[PDB]
Write a protein that binds this ligand. Structure first.
Ligand SMILES: Nc1ncnc2c1ncn2[C@@H]1O[C@H](COP(=O)(O)O)[C@@H](O)[C@H]1O
Ligand SMILES: Nc1ncnc2c1ncn2[C@@H]1O[C@H](COP(=O)(O)O)[C@@H](O)[C@H]1O
Ligand SMILES: Nc1ncnc2c1ncn2[C@@H]1O[C@H](COP(=O)(O)O)[C@@H](O)[C@H]1O
Ligand SMILES: Nc1ncnc2c1ncn2[C@@H]1O[C@H](COP(=O)(O)O)[C@@H](O)[C@H]1O
Lengths: 319, 317, 317, 318
């Protein structure tokens, strides 16, 4: 039976015997995402070039996501990549959830018409205290739901919650997300590696060794294929679907990595873990780092379990 | 004030005093690219998943049928077809179109950028059409371009006057001209190639890549980016500048990419944008084919980046 | 704040402390309707005219399938099917839905507005589901409404709390709420019926019409509009006020529009919008169905206009 | 096997050996009609309703106007929406005068019924500096005319000297597909269309005619009646399914209410080219010499035999 994202989430809420606050939050985020998809695809640019005689996309996506999340009456703290401070929703529109999100990841690459996406992660406010940004600083392990939408050749939403990962595809002709892959699990070992090899001179010796093992295999197996789109969502998605490892490791220029923790690392780490994968900083699992700044960055090496173990072994070999 | 692809192509056709045949051909190609864009975006998959109770094949069919219908073609060479398709006599015209309907079709599962590459040579031969009519060097190209289905659908069309990028507005289904007489940056900052095959790279491309991560003059290293979809990687080179290399690595030491419908369109585009495209040994538009599916090595990009590659190449010959 | 048909129905759902059966049924209906809208706007037909080489059945199938799949229906009565469909025991829920999948389908050739009409009852008996659960008088409706595919697509949804109108934004696949707690004008200035039947009208309606063209006093005449598809005509009546009439006539002694999925849904919308709907002899919402495809007379619209019809009607009984 | 509007129009420009200017005008108009259909269908209303935190017929006029000036094919543009004729800037002038109603019946849009765009195109017949007088040509001199109906699907009906051709917009690729070729009207239909409020003000010929239509003298079946109140929807149903449309003169002007240059003449032209008729009661609509760009005219149009039947009872009350 076809199932849409909306009929799936609603039914899952019924099983969960929830009041419907998270379901609203999610039905809101699903509209924000169709609107961002529509804009990314440039529906309307004829008007910008004077067919009849606008905001930069990342400003617009931040506004659509934030406006729909406030109007859901399910949020109290929202953290966005675009905003230096956590937004505390006005009491009238308050609910119990905290939402960390990256509205248009890889937006830099839009001029080059590169895949771009939206990352989000949902924490329940654990405090009984008046909402402050101290409610967003929860470890990834405490996530209720997390996921991403990827605006590629087609638009796909991947939604991860305690039951697992489910992929959903947008049909633009009717504005519905159809369930196309349920209970997605990742390849145990894959054949591809992703990292920006441009930083070769600033790489950590353990990273340096791991790539070489993939280029010139000791046991003279097939060399691993290289791929690096440079937009996190395109890269974790291909890693989920096909398997392999994605690395955005700590390199000398940026000792804590470059990728932000709450809205890029923890959502992706949670997807990867619920699909049978792993995500590690090198030292710990990404989902266990306890955040001290809502915009804190983390190293991330994530992907197919065997491949992350192999990296972790060359890593442990340099302690 | 607005120009659409249709008004541009019709107007250029007028300036050139053409019979209207190449104009009818480019229009058919435009409709095909929109129909492929809608199908790449999965418009209608709810009907597959049973709401009311192949894509690369579809793309090939859409292009084939539209081109035949244009009454502008005599020989059609496709990536999906082992032999050149010769048009029925009634539907014949003077042009030869070589096209890869959906480059990177593998990647559609990972929803990675996909594209339609195409080249148009005029049939100069007096004879009845045959596969040999597709064996003309890229230097004999009348027009070429691609359509990328990346985060938005953009068509890049290059003809004698220069390159022009067009943005598809899906709402009204119209390609609006967004960039005229495009010229690529002289030097770029990104190098693109699959470093997995490092084990099989001839010493010159190995030395080239090293000079990009550890620069002799102490500049900053180039960034690395590799979609693994030629159209995607060449459009980022066209727009952001840089160099793209699918060299002959020992595993497939003739290159991978095909000359008639992959390398020569992107090469023609690069030359009309002020760029360069080489096999290392010679310029890609000049290598005369022996086989419609002949592979070639190709290195293309900003003039000073491709010039830099040629210098380490010649320092190994 | 924007409110969409999805966010609005959820909230009504939580206020009503429902189990979510009806919310799932209304979510299902929403999807079906955006799918029928696309099919009506002829999306994809290029494919049929060979770009690469009956609308009501597809509409019946989209509403039928989305409804069995909601797990909330147990008896479905469509205009298309001669018998009430009984849902399969695994897929049963408590609601009984009567619907006309693409009302006005006969005029789609002439590109006339078309729409979908639905009513939702709640099964009353504990017996095995049968055609008899569908036979409840209109007064017992939990919700009812229609979707008009006109110059834009609109869904009007009446529930006990009131009538609300939603507009489809086709760029994002969302029904945005544009009018909330609609109420109809008390007296209108448009009368709507097929005056071609004049030879067969009973004297009450023949007097009533003459009374609108030649006012017995000296009011301006009422203007006349008859699009010819109930959804288009009753939607104009709701928005602009007036009266719509499709009475019995000798050839249709019992009327022509069907009680269960045409008259009762519109009567419920009229009545919750502060309007009236009558057969002439009794309110449409109070007649008891004996058969599912039963015909009935209906005059509906602004309260003052319908009352003035009822006075000339009773003057001839 | 498709032929699109772009291909049909281009192939036809080539056969007629034109310079290509009429082809640029007609191409420009096709885009403007697709831009309007998107707007009519409410694509984007979420932004107006604040998803991120009449104007429709003024926008329609802006889309048609700016697309035709840029075609470089026009020199005088007469719009319903504008009091005076627009003269094109000397550097963008071509040889065509276009008369158009950019969104016909945009009163019915609240109620969401069918609205449409109507146009007729003329060639400038004199050497003089362009003026409103260039637009003052009887419809007999039209080069091409048509309309676009934004009904349940969007359709463009184009009528040129060779015939009337109906094209359907596939919105999923924005392409007008030729769905029917060289269209001909039925000789006689079974629908009559007019607003019967005016019964009080109807002159005796149309009162007699409509009466013969509901109480048919020869005891045949009576005609059905339909009236949408948007001329595009009403004339289109008349083309497609046959019958008669009337919007006659009465005390609300002895001259009718619809307009000659951009409502009457385009539909009168399409009607004749589909094998139908269009009269003012006295002269064929395509022959009345206009003297003002917003001049009104009575119009009865439709199947040949039906218009001929009205002319018989019209002539009876003179
Ligand atoms: N739609 C949903 N799908 C998954 N679980 C949900 C759903 N809605 C609510 N639940 C769960 O029930 C708890 C309370 O939900 P709620 O009452 O809606 O705020 C949440 O923390 C969720 O984990
Ligand atoms: N639309 C076009 N834009 C660019 N040049 C064209 C155009 N159409 C034709 N010409 C030129 O004229 C030659 C013959 O065109 P034709 O006779 O129309 O098929 C072409 O091969 C082009 O070099
Ligand atoms: N979404 C809703 N809109 C308004 N009424 C509702 C809704 N959901 C539940 N109801 C009311 O509560 C009753 C039980 O609904 P339910 O248990 O979900 O099937 C229905 O018959 C309605 O009268
Ligand atoms: N696309 C076409 N369809 C049919 N007739 C055309 C078309 N293009 C040109 N014509 C005819 O040729 C004449 C001269 O063409 P032009 O020089 O472009 O204005 C026009 O006034 C028309 O009568």
């Amino acid at each position: 039976d076809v199932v849409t994202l909306t009929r799936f989430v609603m039914e899952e809420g019924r099983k969960a015997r929830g009041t419907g606050e998270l379901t609203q939050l999610l039905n809101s985020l699903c509209t924000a995402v169709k609107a961002i998809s529509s804009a990314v695809r440039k529906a309307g640019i004829a008007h910008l070039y004077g067919i009849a005689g606008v905001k930069k996309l990342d400003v617009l996506s931040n506004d659509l996501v934030m406006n729909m999340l406030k109007s859901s009456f399910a949020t109290c703290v929202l953290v966005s990549e675009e905003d230096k401070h956590a937004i505390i929703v006005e009491p009238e529109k308050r609910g119990k959830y905290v939402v960390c999100f990256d509205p248009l990841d890889g937006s830099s690459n839009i001029d080059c018409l590169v895949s771009v996406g939206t990352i989000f992660g949902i924490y329940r406010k654990k405090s009984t205290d008046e909402p402050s940004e101290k409610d967003a600083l929860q470890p990834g392990r405490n996530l209720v739901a997390a996921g991403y939408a990827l605006y590629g050749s087609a638009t796909m939403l991947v939604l991860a919650m305690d039951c697992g990962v489910n992929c959903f595809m947008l049909d633009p002709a009717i504005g519905e997300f159809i369930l196309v892959d349920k209970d997605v699990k990742i390849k145990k070992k894959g054949k591809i590696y992703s990292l920006n090899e441009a930083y070769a001179k600033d790489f950590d010796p353990a990273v340096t060794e791991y790539i070489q093992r993939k280029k010139f295999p000791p046991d003279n197996s097939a060399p691993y294929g290289a791929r690096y789109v440079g937009s996190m969502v395109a890269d974790v998605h291909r890693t989920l679907v096909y398997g392999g490892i994605f690395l955005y490791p700590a390199n000398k220029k940026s000792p804590n990595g470059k990728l932000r923790l709450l809205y890029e690392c923890n959502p992706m780490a949670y997807v990867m873990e619920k699909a049978g994968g792993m995500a590690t900083t090198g030292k710990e699992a990404v989902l266990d780092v306890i955040p001290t700044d809502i915009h804190q960055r983390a190293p991330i090496i994530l992907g197919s379990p065997d491949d992350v173990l192999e990296f972790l072994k060359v890593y442990e070999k340099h302690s």
